[PDB]
Structures are given as structure tokens and as C-alpha cells.
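Co-fold these.
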Amino acid sequence: LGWESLKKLLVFTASGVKPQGKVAAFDLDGTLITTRSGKVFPTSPSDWRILYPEIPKKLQELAAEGYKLVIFTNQMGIGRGKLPAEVFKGKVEAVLEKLGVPFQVLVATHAGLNRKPVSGMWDHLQEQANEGIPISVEDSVFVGDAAGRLANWAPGRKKKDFSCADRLFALNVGLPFATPEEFFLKWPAARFELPAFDPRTISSAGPLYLPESSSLLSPNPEVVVAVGFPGAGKSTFIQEHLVSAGYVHVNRDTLGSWQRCVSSCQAALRQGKRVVIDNTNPDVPSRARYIQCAKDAGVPCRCFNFCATIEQARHNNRFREMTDPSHAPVSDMVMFSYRKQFEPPTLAEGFLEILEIPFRLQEHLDPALQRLYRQFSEG
Amino acid sequence: RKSSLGWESLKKLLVFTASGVKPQGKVAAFDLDGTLITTRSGKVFPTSPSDWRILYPEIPKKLQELAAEGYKLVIFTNQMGIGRGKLPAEVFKGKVEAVLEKLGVPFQVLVATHAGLNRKPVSGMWDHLQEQANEGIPISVEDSVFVGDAAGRLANWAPGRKKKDFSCADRLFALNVGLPFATPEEFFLKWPAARFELPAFDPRTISSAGPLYLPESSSLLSPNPEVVVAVGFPGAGKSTFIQEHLVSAGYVHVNRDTLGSWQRCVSSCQAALRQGKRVVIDNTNPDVPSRARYIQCAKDAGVPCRCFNFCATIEQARHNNRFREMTDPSHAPVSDMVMFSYRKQFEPPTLAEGFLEILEIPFRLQEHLDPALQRLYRQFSEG
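Predicted complex below.
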């Protein structure tokens, strides 16, 4: 073995690499090497130096201890065509020569499962790149600069970390984690923050809606107005519980305008059918339209308030981007536009009742896709 | 037919299946013209069988990514030129194979040759894929996707494209089937969803609900002799409504298409009133002078005259014709010339013309339709 080109993945295996039950794993940029010129993006393929003088000696001590030395690096520039693959391989080989110790390098080249903090590269390490030898995760380490540290975590470091990917990667595997200065220079633990939403512990347990005493659907004609972030999981919930149960689906992304939504709502009510307005519906003016249609027809109007937070819907968008090749990308501009327009649905508007729909893990998901769901999608 | 090695010529349908095509539980389906390929020349019509180029460089990679993910790759293309005799069948067959060679991916190609069920927006070609072209394997609709450029997009949706979408066919095809839709720009390039519009008439709004006639306090039959003047577009369902509610209860039918001339229509009206009967004038009667001749027949026989004003709009009646064209073998096709001529001539019926009362007949769903035919009726049948 030497270099390997695989499915959205590059793997280098040097001379002297022996499989072990322990792994000392490392990020590349910001952890083992850094830029000579002080800039974030390297100016050339020779704009690199070994980060700390203490590094090579530590790596020898780890290798003699019986740790398999492994690199996990994200390099999106390879897949995009920016950074040529051969240029990076040449850089890598020069670095490992300067480190003076056998390494195995795993390079994520495309978005998706292999990209940190998603743990696809660790999966490949265990399932393919270790000679069947099981790795004790508790007896291992991952070291990386993207650790989500707060502002002023050390003197000199006034600004917070750009990313939390390295720390979350370790949390997705279960690896003990250290920052470059903690691990190599024996600095005290720096203060950090994690995402407000932890997907690792999300379950499908709990009530489908609240209050539990309420009736989910009506045996009689009505209008249901759905309120939630884009990516709150509305459409999937709507299709399963309402539309396939006989409700007329009114969707703005299919109809093209709100006037057409109002039109469809009125038309369906004249046919004595129950309707769902499957829109974001962030503000009172938006919902007022569909409340008015219910009045005109003399049917009750109910609200389905999806409780997904911005971080939960964004995570759900990231999962769909990762699993579904036909998924239209929900931008930050749209996500934060919803939050700016958002007014909490009240009974004062004209609703008979409002139901809360909690954000839950999808029950219908495959075991392998649940495994993927319960991981941090972005640093 | 099911499972073929290559090309097969079915009823108003051509199907190609390349080698290496597997049946799948999901489908990435595409349009051909303006979606996967465009003209090399830049004009609307191709100048040669080689006057084509792949629309966007990103396309081939995306097709491979979808194939690897277990999506069956299908092309739904409208080629009326083959049916109309304008384009030879062998030239297009040779063109498709060349395109599929350049794309470097196993495709199944479905070609609508004539008008009718297979002519998208109508879902005939998709239903054939489910029932005949996928080898027993059911396709999850919501797990699939259709991509096309006939998407009813408004003017100036991108830089340098002043003209709006010529058609809305591709989007409505997916809307009929229930498929997730994307434009090539949205699908391949990840460009923001472009603003669009659906046709003013949505077939799904038509049902058996609501009143049969307005006002409801009236009665459409009369015990004493009268003349009923029908007013409505060709394809409004005048004839059907009248035959069910009036003729079957003893009203004399007067119809221009059957009788041959307007003077023959006036004679038959006069003769019916001479026999002391009540008569319906089942003609289009778009204008005041044309329907005045029958109001005069009523006055001369000393009987009242009523108007049945059929509410079908032009789009509603054109939908109705296209539906009859797909379902009734003995249906005479109404041209768009006659449809436009009625609209130009049309004058709203008023009481000042000499009517006793005017009834409005809402465009309701045709009575006694089998479930399968109702589902065909709810489909958009024109892009």
C-alpha cells in the first residue's frame, strides 16, 4: 500500500504502519502543521512548517507507547477542483518526512459522510484501514484546532474559534479530545461551547402533539394552518398524518403564490374537504388569510405549531442535503428571514385551538440513517 | 410490452431501454429539450440531427451520482412532430442514442408521439413506467424527482433570459403524478427557486359539489310550452346537460351540428311550438342577434323564453374537449379557431333581449363518471 483513491476519500499508508487497538489521531492544518506566512490560507504548497518544536518528540513517544498515528483531514478543495490532488499528496509526504514517524492519513475530499464532524473517516479506519483489529475508543485520542473555544480563552487569542468540527468529531465517535496546545504544550483546558442542540441523544419518544387530550384530526371540514421553520419536518408530518388521511394539501412551493394558496383553500372548502396549509406561515398577516377562509366557509380553523428550533431545522436541512440528492438547499438568508418575521401564534388571531408539534427523531428512518442523524452535522 | 432490449414502437409511444438499465424503487426523470440538451445553433428548432449540446457541464456527473444512489434514470420527452409527420421516427431514434452516448449513462427513454394520454402534462407516460416498463417493481413517488424546463417561470428569472417559459408542461406533469419537481437550473446548478405561475384553471377544483343551477329557487323544467336558449362555449357540456335534464323529459332538441343550418334550426323551433311542445336550442348562441331569432319564435307562438347561460370559461371548455378527445372515440375535435371566434362574438345574455329568466349553469363535473375517468379529469392536460 501507498496512496489510495476511494469513494470521496484519499488514504495514505506509510512504511512502518502497524494496526493497533489504540489510535492517536490528529487534525492536519492548525494541529500538526501551520502556515509560515501567518495567513489562514496557504500562499503556496511550501507555505507550511511543523507547528510546535515539541511535536515530533511527542509522536515518537506515542508510537513507542503503541498508539497508531493517524491523520484525519478535511480538504474540500480537492473535490471542487481548486487544490490538485497530486499537489496535496506531495505536501503530505514532505510533512510526514519532517515528522520522522510512520503515519496513516485519511483525507476527506467531498462533502457528506466523510467530512468532519461526521465520523465516516473513523468508520473507514475501523472497517477497512485497520487490519481487522478492533480499536478501543476509550484508550485513544483525537487532537484538533477546531475546538469551539470561547473568545479570550488564552492571552493573545481574543477571537473565538471559527469551527467546532474537531471536538464534535470526537463526540460523534466517543473519543477523548485535546487541543493542540493542551496535548503538546500541556496548557490547561480551554473554555468551549457546544451547539445548543445535541442530536446524539434525540429520540422518537414522547407525545406526537400537545395537549394529548386534543384530537389530532377532525371528522368534519376545517382548515389547518401549519407554522414552522423551513426544514422543521412539516411536509413529512403533513403527508403522513393529514394528507394520506384525507386532507387536501395546500403547498406554496408547489403552487407559486399565496393568492393561489387562498384560492385552493376556498375551492377545497366548497367541496366539503378538510385542508392543510403547508407553509412557513411566520406572521399574523399570513395566517389571517387562511383564518378568514375558514370564517367565510363557516368551518373551524386550527393551528399546528411546529416547535423545531433554528438549530434543529438547520440540522435537518444538513441531513437531507447529505442523504437526498434531490433536496433543494435551504439557505441561511431564508432561515434567518423566517426568524425575523416570526410572531408566536395566539388564540387571539381567530384559532379554535393551537397544537404543539415537538421536534423528534423520525420513527420511519432506517437504523443506519438514524445512526447518521444522531451526529453533529456542522462545526 | 414489458422488458425490451432497445427500441419498441407501442400505441402512440416509443420506448428505448439501454443495456445496464435496472428497475428501481425510485426514479430520476428528465425532460430532453431544454433540460438535458439544447440547440448548438441557438435557435428554437434544431437545424440538424447533430444540432445539440449538453445544456450544462455539471449534468453527466450528476447523472452518475444518481445512478450510484439507486435512482432509475428516465427521459420523458414530447415529440408531436413524429406523430404529425413533420419529423421522421428514425432520425430522432438515432439522435437519442447519440445523446445517451455523450451522457455516458444507461437511460430509459419514453417518447410521446401524438396527443392524448402520453402527451405530458398528462401522466400516461408515467403510468406506463409503473405498470409496464419497471419490471414489477413499484416506484415511490415522493422518493423520486422530475426535472424539466417547461416550468411556467415568469419573465427575467435569471440574468439574460427576458422571455418567460413557453410552457408549464413539465411542472404540471409532476403535479399530476405527485412527483417533486425541479428546473434544470434548480436541480443541476443549485440556483434559487425561480418564480412561477400555474394555469388560471385548475382541473382539481371541479367537482359534483355546489348547485346544479342558479338561482336554486327556479326550476329548470317548465310544465307549459317555452323556448330555452342555451348559451355556452363549444365543449361546455351544453349537449350533455340538456339531454339529461330536458330532452329525457320531453323537450324537443334543436342542434345546429345535427340539423345542418341555422334556418333549419328556426324551422324546427317553430314546428315544435306548433305541436304545442317545449323546445331547447342547443347551439352556442354567443351573440344577441343570433339568439334573438329564437326569442322571436317564442313571441310568435305566445310562449315565454328562457336562457341557460353555461358558466364554462374558455380554458374549462378546452380542457373538456381534450378530455373527450382522450376518452370518446366518436368525438369530433373542436379547433381553436372556433373557440376564439366564439369568444370574439360573445355577448352576455340580458333580460332586455326579451327573456323571462336567465339561469346560470356552473361548470360541474360530468355526471356518472367511473373513478378512473375522474382521476384523468383532474389532471392538467395542456402545458
